[PDB]
Amino acid sequence: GAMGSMERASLIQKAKLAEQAERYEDMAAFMKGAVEKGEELSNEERNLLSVAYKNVVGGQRAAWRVLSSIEQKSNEEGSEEKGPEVREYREKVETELQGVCDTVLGLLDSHLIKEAGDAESRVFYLKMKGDYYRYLAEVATGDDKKRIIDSARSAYQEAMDISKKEMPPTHPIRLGLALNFSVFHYEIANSPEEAISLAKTTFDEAMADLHTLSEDSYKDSTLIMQLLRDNLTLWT
């Protein structure tokens, strides 16, 4: 593509530099170029790909929420007619966010998921698939909203099924997947009970397997376990 003439290793080196410079749009474009080289990603490279886009879409989502909240206030009784600008600009931000999601989903479908045979790669990509459909669902308001939602559910559920069969209950990818699937239940699928049960059960099964870990793996798992606990505290 745009990154067609750059060496794969140079793209990776540059993605790491853009991360250090907090240049996440650049980071993401370098990683998209690396994926498009056609070779599978290593563990480190999957982590770079995920960080790049999560940061980019995370800035777009925060912006969309600011603008959506302004837009709703302007639609309240007694608010003065501001004209079309707030809706137009929210739509602009929304469209760009949707294009980022479509780009990630594109990479996963062409051809990351189909070549991912190990549990750690396959679950990682399926979690990303559920995440980007979930970001689409956050902004969806039309006839496709139910289908977007259930594409998020189906990707998360396939990732859960594999992670349960193939990964220990403390694996960070298993834990991060459950945390996000649990947020999907709470916030997207209007199933706060399912959200809470999943976060509880995931946390308790991780607790009971901590004993098997080195001190460095202990540190990695308890970090995400803490985020499960934060949501349980907020939700109960």
Partner: peptide, 6 residues
């Protein structure tokens, strides 16, 4: 305040 995701 805002729920956590990762």
């Amino acid at each position: 305040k805002r729920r956590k995701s990762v």
